[PDB]
């Protein structure tokens, strides 16, 4: 199947859907259905530790949003790596799980309000001293293009095309999340592109990050979705041509 689709290796095709597989596996919420029981043999990884090493960047955010911090701690001390570093490396993927639910009409319905509630609970919980709460703001400010790219990649506008990985939001929700991020800033500016303009090289990174994932894939639908994300970002950039993008406009 992977050879027919065009992936040079089975690992690439299988990891293209790994986030959806992990979320669907955890959605069963049964005692026998656990991350350890996940069939890593479908991947070429021989043992569970290799699977953890190769996919922690995907598995950790799901455990964090589902509040199984004991599970990620267990993964950390079996993988023989810094638990602090493991939690830090996956920060943008977790942020695109908590942040977007604040800025879109909370408590509008009983359905989507619980996502807001659990996101707020989790975010307030990592603010404690034991977790990243001491330098959470510094980690937020330090690599802002990462959150921007990961938030952009969740774009999905409802035609007759496959849906992306499970966390996906419409464009207006992404813009609301950007507005909330800018508002939550200490100086409280109206536009995210202002703080993005503090480091002019950031525009270089984001445009590359959208470009890179555009070139790695060969599926037409995924390429079209990435092109739509690119169009959204470029339109947002052009909307702030009045003041210039910190000397990086050319």
């Amino acid at each position: 199947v992977s050879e027919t689709f065009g992936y040079r290796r089975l690992e690439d095709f299988m990891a293209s859907h790994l986030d959806y597989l992990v979320l669907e596996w955890l959605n069963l919420q049964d005692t026998e259905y656990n991350l350890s029981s996940f069939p890593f043999i479908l991947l070429n990884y021989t043992n569970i530790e290799d699977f953890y090493r190769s996919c922690y960047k995907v598995l950790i955010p799901h455990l964090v949003i589902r509040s199984h911090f004991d599970e990620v701690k267990s993964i950390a001390n079996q993988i023989q790596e810094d638990w602090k570093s493991l939690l830090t490396d996956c920060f943008p993927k977790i942020l695109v799980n908590i942040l977007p639910y604040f800025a879109y009409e909370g408590t509008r319905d009983s359905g989507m309000a619980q996502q807001r509630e659990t996101a707020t609970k989790v975010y307030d919980m990592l603010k404690s001293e034991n977790l990243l709460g001491k330098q959470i703001d510094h980690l937020f400010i330090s690599n802002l293009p990462e959150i921007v790219v990961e938030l952009l990649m969740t774009l999905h506008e409802p035609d007759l095309d496959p849906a992306p990985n499970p966390p996906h939001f419409p464009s207006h929700v992404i813009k609301a999340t950007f507005a909330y991020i800018s508002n939550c800033h200490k100086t409280k500016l109206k536009s995210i592109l202002e703080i993005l303009s503090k480091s002019p090289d950031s525009y270089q990174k984001i445009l590359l990050a959208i470009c890179e994932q555009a070139a790695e894939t060969n599926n037409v639908y995924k390429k079209h979705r990435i092109l739509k994300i690119y169009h959204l970002f470029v339109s947002l950039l052009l909307k702030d041509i009045k003041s210039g993008l910190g000397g990086a406009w050319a």
Binding site: P200, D201, Y203, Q204, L208, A250
Partner: protein, 133 residues
Amino acid sequence: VRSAAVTCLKNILATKTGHSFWEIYKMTTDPMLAYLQPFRTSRKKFLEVPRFDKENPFEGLDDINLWIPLSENHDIWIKTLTCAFLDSGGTKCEILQLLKPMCEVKTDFCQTVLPYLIHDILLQDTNESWRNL
């Protein structure tokens, strides 16, 4: 290639030689200055390019097979020769040290940069060991 070029541009502009180049070159009108504005940054301390002292700086280059493999593969030959010149400690110019990632991805860049590496090697040559080799 784009990512390697961006990394090399940042590294070169960060060093003292890049700053000194910018002081002279900013007077002239050129689109390249406009393109390179975002990558440049102002820092209190200049970028430091590490110097490693090889026990024998000549063992990497004193290989006849390295100079003439000639197995109908020009690209890997030129890449290996440029890399062998770069990984030796003979090179003294700092901006030449930062050209390895872009050399690894482009053969034309290796061909362009090899004469400069040889010239820099011979410029710092003492007792004519490098010249003889």
